């Protein structure tokens, strides 16, 4: 797949003025734009291949972000009232929306989710024509809006505008965005006690972010109990990850790490060598 | 590109 996603965060700060508001845009696993109402309170480029867009684009995106911030300010007041919370506490409204392309480059699917204070609130259905309450009483405002109308405007965005511009972005940044960088792999050995050592399987400088690291033992079909770290950014646009297995000291060469990544023509197998 | 519209959330 390819995806165009935005991540919106609004945080109320009662007494200290209007809520903090941040939007970030991603094409696949590459951030390309950001808005911050505390920062130049505008949408700004965050990938090199975005820097030569006209003021028309930046003015439009700035106002869309601004308008979202203002509506999220209204939503935070509504949600405070809904959960019967104090006007003194800080609360968080999060909004995620994205469209994806299939192999053919046509619309595959869209999605939108809201969260209040880190909990699922409201989800756009897979048909994109109605909203599902995840929390009880969660809705599009019956009184001041329309479930069907809201879904329709988001559906048009996801099926049309989101797909159209995902293509424009993939073209503008194709040298980086469409390049598969396979993981550089190795295994390190770390004695932790007299009787046990940690085998750590490394994947470095890979793109995109999706990757599978599994440990197997020779003579055992099942995969072993594995410590996985969160996939982390290198800061250069590539990612890092490792999987660790605790094994008996002296028995390290009986274990294999198996690495699966889009940029690898077939799965890679590594074995620690002393 | 961002959507022009942010959904208005409600209660009940």
């Amino acid at each position: 797949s390819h995806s165009l996603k935005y991540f919106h965060t609004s945080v109320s700060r009662p007494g200290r003025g209007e809520p903090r508001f941040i939007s970030v845009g991603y094409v696949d696993d590459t951030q390309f734009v950001r808005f911050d109402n505390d920062a130049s309170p505008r949408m700004v480029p965050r990938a090199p291949w975005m820097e030569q867009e006209g003021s028309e684009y930046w003015d439009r995106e700035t106002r869309s972000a601004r308008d979202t911030a203002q509506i999220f300010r209204v939503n935070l007041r509504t949600l405070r009232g809904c959960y019967n919370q104090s006007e003194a506490g800080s609360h968080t409204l999060q909004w995620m929306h994205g469209c994806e392309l299939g192999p053919d480059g046509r619309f595959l699917r869209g999605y939108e989710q809201f969260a209040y204070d880190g909990k699922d609130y409201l989800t756009l259905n897979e048909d994109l024509r109605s909203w599902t309450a995840v929390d009880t009483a969660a809705q599009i405002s019956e009184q001041k809006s329309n479930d069907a109308s809201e879904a329709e405007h988001q559906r048009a965005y996801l099926e049309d505008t989101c797909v159209e511009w995902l293509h424009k972005y993939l073209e503008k940044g194709k040298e980086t965005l469409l390049h598969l960088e396979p993981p550089k792999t190795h295994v390190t050995h770390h004695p932790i006690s007299d009787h046990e050592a940690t085998l750590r399987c490394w994947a470095l400088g890979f793109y995109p972010a999706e990757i599978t690291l599994t440990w197997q033992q020779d003579g055992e079909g099942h995969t072993q109990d594995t410590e996985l770290v969160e996939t982390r950014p290198a800061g250069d646009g590539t990612f890092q990850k490792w999987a660790a297995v605790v094994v008996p000291s002296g028995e390290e060469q009986r274990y294999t790490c198996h690495v699966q990544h889009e940029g690898l023509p077939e799965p890679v197998t590594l074995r620690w060598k002393p | 590109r961002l959507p022009a519209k942010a959904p208005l959330l409600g209660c009940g």
Partner: T-cell receptor
Amino acid sequence: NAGVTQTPKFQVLKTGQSMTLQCSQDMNHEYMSWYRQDPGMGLRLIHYSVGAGITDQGEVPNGYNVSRSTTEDFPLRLLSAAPSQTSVYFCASSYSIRGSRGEQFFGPGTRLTVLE
Amino acid sequence: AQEVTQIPAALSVPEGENLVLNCSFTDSAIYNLQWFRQDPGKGLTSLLLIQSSQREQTSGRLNASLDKSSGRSTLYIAASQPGDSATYLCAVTNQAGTALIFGKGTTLSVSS
């Protein structure tokens, strides 16, 4: 309910003078807006509010300020009156913009003339 | 932005004749379309509200239609009367869905 009230009904200003057009509504409406009406230009949005403490620029914001410290009041200030601000000024409110209860109520308007 | 046009700017019909007032808008992504009457020296008064999912709204000799996809509304005034003489203004929800954008209106004169 009085609906949307506007003062004054008529006003003359000298170029450079300041002026607050008063608007209030007693319908508890979150949504309020200011328009100017000019011949062959129609009804143009100056500023709008989606709730107490929340304001944004419309089609023609330049030369005008608004505040929304309360639900009831949405005053429009001309900071430095110019002849180009000679117009009829309408304040509007509604229960909602996106809902079935979407009826927009207008004030009687303020005829403003700015003279050198 | 959302752009609203009303054709024609001025209309003059003999009383008893059917007439259409036209409203077209550039962005079909609207929640509501609203028709208003304005008498000289007075404010606007709402005639008809049509929701995005609705196709027509009726009020006596007034029947407004909505076609979102085409971006059109037509206010049909059947058997027009001198008292219908006024300015008719069309409004749609702006792109943000936070305020109403108005067409420049049609001045209707139903001659006695």
